[PDB]
Design a binder for this molecule. Structure first.
Ligand SMILES: *[C@@H](C=O)COP(=O)(O)O
Ligand SMILES: *[C@@H](C=O)COP(=O)(O)O
Lengths: 337, 337
């Protein structure tokens, strides 16, 4: 944790987001990907999970738009149909390799969650399995109900995120901290805005109390919207205004980038919100980019459907959707390249 | 607290610091100024306090360097020798008028302090006395000993600052929040650095929990150094490095400016640290300027000495010291204008 060591972390964080690039999140656990597969009639075999990731990672030209990919631990042990380790597909493309390091969530208080896995995190970061990884991801999730998120749950999750971040950095990995505001709930956009300001300001408190190197941390955040069960409407401009206000109010100049999660919003909406936030005026130092799983890969799944004959078209949709995300990351989606 | 109302606050915060300008703090209570007077053989009469402020405010050309002045409540009731209200001296110069609104400090826990006066703050902000004021100041003070500042004292002071800030803004005043790290103590520069990161990150938490308009808040901060009782040395470059790192780690892009307090450091050291921080590289949105009482007015006091014959020379020293501070505010002190 010397000066050159700290500069390498900042260089990695910037490389992931250079030139309007963003992150393809491919880190779904077998259970989470399985559910997605089963809706579309695809069998949850290890082989189909391996093939799905091969389809994503082998897409030609994807590195123009994708600066990093977040892998699931299992995918590090996997090869392509042709024999090449899946990580080698990304390395050869110059794409940064990430590892999701949380062990999921457990119950906290009444109706809330904390994320787990810190006890062996340092040991796991040193696994030879992840030797090629240069960044990591850890997700917490904030449920919304009456009087919730509670302050205890904000503090505990921010504490856990910050502890994970410092361990990552000590092992030479850039941490993505993901304080996700869960979309499935009944809350107004005002309430999301206000609580996002609490969560993000508290996260910055704990990162600072843990003396995390702030230029080597990426924040993966939810857009500010009302909850899916609210009857409240919003437009991309309003999402952009509220989200950017919350970020300008909470995120220090030293943070290199914010990457938005799609969170259950549509692919089109998530990309449209990104474009709108990048068209907003308001001085800032950090990039506003993407870390999408669903918004980038739902179309791939829906086109592929487990049939090899559909793969070329599935890869085409990945590339085209990645292009749009990247254009959104620079506020240029309305403009012809 | 409508949109135009919020834009006026941001415009005021920017006007105070435009063009490398800074703040002349002249807000010493009769007791605090009195002690300064008595060291230099000057009688603590109301007349000498009035005359001292007249000497400061009537200095020709001071508005090139000073964007705002922080007044003591008593000075709003005062006139020049020639009959002109002292506030009119500043208004005519286009200098923003501020009011210090705290009622000082009281004991908290063991050996710590909190600042007081929130109970009638809203009423006081509406006083016709302060009709010409456009900004305010409120000071908390953090003592350092073993295990101190305590977390309770950080939280309580940040809470008080944030409550004051929101009341100010609701009354159309830009709040300066002053979480001063007291120089008189025995602590290392590492410890100051780490605790400054705790204090400033926690302050940003409470400002966010109070839903303060972040573009309409100014932060008056201590430089990061070791304590006066420490035998540890430092240079301007090291102060600059540590202070800017702490600020980049904690202060959101939305804050318009940080103004350093001189804090018991020499006039020359305080101006030299300002120059050094403004020569540092590292992207940021906020101005780095000054809010000095001692660093700007100790020389004036020492030249004047209560003798009218010395006033012209005293004003010359104010103007020359203000020039240097302003050059420091743009990192140009080594360079000839
Ligand atoms: C990133 C997960 O690692 C965000 O995924 P989403 O875009 O919400 O499916
Ligand atoms: C500002 C007081 O209002 C700072 O005063 P100092 O420069 O520390 O004497």
């Amino acid at each position: 944790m010397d000066c050159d060591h700290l500069l390498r972390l900042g260089m990695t964080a910037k490389k992931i987001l250079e030139n309007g690039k963003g992150i393809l999140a491919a880190d779904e656990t077998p259970k989470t990907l399985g559910r997605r597969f089963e809706k579309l009639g695809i069998t949850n075999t290890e082989e189909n999970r391996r093939k799905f990731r091969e389809i994503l990672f082998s897409t030609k030209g994807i590195e123009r738009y994708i600066g990093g990919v977040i892998l699931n631990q299992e995918t590090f042990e996997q090869t392509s149909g042709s024999g090449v380790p899946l990580t080698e597909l990304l390395k050869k493309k110059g794409i940064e390799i990430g590892i999701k390091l949380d062990k999921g969530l457990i119950d906290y208080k009444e109706k809330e969650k904390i994320s787990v896995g810190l006890e062996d995190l340092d040991l796991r970061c040193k696994s030879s399995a992840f030797k090629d990884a240069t960044f990591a991801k850890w997700r917490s999730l904030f449920y919304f109900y009456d009087g919730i998120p509670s302050e205890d749950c904000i503090n505990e999750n921010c504490s856990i995120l910050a502890k994970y971040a410092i361990i990552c950095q000590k092992n030479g990995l850039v941490p993505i901290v993901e304080p996700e505001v869960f979309l499935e709930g009944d809350y107004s956009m005002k309430r999301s805005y206000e609580v996002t300001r609490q969560i993000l300001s508290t996260l910055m408190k704990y990162l600072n109390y843990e003396l995390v190197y702030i230029p080597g941390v990426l924040i993966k955040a939810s857009y500010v919207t009302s909850g899916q069960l609210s009857n409240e409407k919003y437009t991309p401009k309003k999402v952009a205004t509220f989200t950017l206000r919350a970020l300008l109010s909470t995120i220090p100049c030293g943070i290199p980038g914010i990457v938005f999660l799609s969170g259950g919003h549509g692919s089109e909406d998530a990309i449209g919100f990104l474009n709108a936030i990048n068209m907003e005026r308001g001085c800032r130092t950090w990039s506003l980019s993407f870390s999408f799983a669903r918004a980038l890969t739902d179309g791939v799944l829906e086109t592929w459907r487990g049939d090899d004959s559909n793969i070329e078209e599935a890869q085409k949709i990945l590339l085209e959707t990645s292009f749009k995300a990247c254009r959104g990351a620079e506020g240029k989606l309305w403009d012809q390249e």
